[PDB]
Design a protein around this ligand. Structure first.
Ligand SMILES: Cc1cc2nc3c(=O)[nH]c(=O)nc-3n(C[C@H](O)[C@H](O)[C@H](O)COP(=O)(O)O)c2cc1C
Ligand SMILES: Cc1cc2nc3c(=O)[nH]c(=O)nc-3n(C[C@H](O)[C@H](O)[C@H](O)COP(=O)(O)O)c2cc1C
Lengths: 197, 197
């Protein structure tokens, strides 16, 4: 089986979500040693912003910049469709996801490729996947009205076919050492229950 | 009084939200001729993505790139604080706002500048504003679970102090000519009720 890990924090080795993604990988390698794991760091190797020129590349001959972004989109969709387990690190910045992750989403969502229209609605074409979202927050938003990230991720992932999503939260990072420790400990325990399922 | 219009679509003169923002400006000029209106097109003049280098500029001496982004952030916050009425065009792309608008948000949200921490929580420092969100959608999401854009905008704007927000929806653009006409007509009528309040 095949695991894809998508890192999206801008805080590099200080990132809470990267430390937790790295813990997931460690645990996965020990407990499922035959599985191949690919890590894509969307901050280290940024995906361009979706602009008018790029959306044209996805939807006459293309400019160099456009051909290249189509190629990238194809590469990213191919990689997603190639993996069985999708781990998405989704730190919350200003009540949204990171722009790093977003730009990835904007190249992956493509009609007739990752979803298609039917009579009874759109349906996703990325099938058979199990996702895990590792989402870190300075504050505490879980199950509250200020967490749009969680439902947005469920919505966006479901749209492209990924309806089996498990969320791992690391909240209250900003609230001192007991709380930041609690966040790590709680997230790791959640990861452990997933890895040993 | 002073009106700031923030355009965020990537579809230029084909943009539904830009056409509706332009209608708002037209109507505002006719009905409040003394008011000064500023239009900032976040697609035409893009704001950089918030990355590790830039967040450093906001939070030792800075690189050229960092000083410049601080300067930009200061300019954007100064402009926002200078206006009374804030019109934000928020087309929905892949269940989020545009990255164009987002990058603006990521430079405007700054502790001790647009919000501050207190004992009873954070409180916004952009006070006295009236916002209008003009949000366009191919589908129909209003009051449903797939509209995270609306609560995200309320949340993010409220965080920085902008708690008086009125939403103008133009939905079902993608559903043929009666529906796209309906969207325009319904949005314009909503704008009209706002402009003549
Ligand atoms: C740009 C910026 C924006 C942030 N916005 C929020 C916020 O909306 N809500 C919150 O609870 N924490 C916020 N935080 C705190 C982060 O969510 C917290 O540091 C989390 O650990 C980030 O994950 P990371 O370390 O993997 O990048 C923000 C941090 C930064 C850098
Ligand atoms: C990149 C892309 C993504 C889109 N995503 C959605 C979507 O999530 N939901 C929806 O209802 N419409 C979606 N649409 C349709 C737009 O919301 C619709 O065309 C709206 O009119 C866009 O505003 P604009 O013309 O001002 O840019 C999308 C369009 C594009 C270009």
């Amino acid at each position: 089986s095949k695991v894809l890990v998508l890192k999206s924090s801008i805080l590099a080795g200080y990132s809470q979500s990267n430390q937790l993604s790295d813990y997931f990988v460690e645990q996965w390698r020990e407990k499922h040693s035959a599985d191949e794991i690919t890590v894509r760091d969307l901050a280290a190797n940024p995906i361009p912003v979706l602009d008018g020129e790029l959306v044209g590349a996805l939807r006459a001959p293309l400019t160099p910049r456009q051909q290249e972004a189509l190629a990238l989109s194809d590469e990213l969709i191919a990689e997603l469709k190639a993996h069985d387990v999708i781990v998405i690190a989704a730190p919350m910045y200003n009540f949204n996801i990171s722009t790093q992750l977003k730009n990835y989403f904007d190249l992956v969502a493509r009609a007739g490729v990752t979803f298609r229209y039917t009579e009874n609605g759109p349906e996703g074409l990325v099938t058979g996947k199990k996702a895990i979202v590792i989402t870190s927050r300075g504050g505490i938003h879980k199950d509250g009205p200020t967490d749009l990230v969680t439902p947005y991720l469920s919505t966006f992932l479901g749209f492209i076919g990924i309806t089996d999503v498990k969320f791992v939260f690391a909240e209250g990072i900003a609230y001192g050492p007991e709380m930041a420790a609690k966040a790590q400990s709680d997230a790791k325990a959640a990861i452990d229950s997933i890895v040993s399922a």
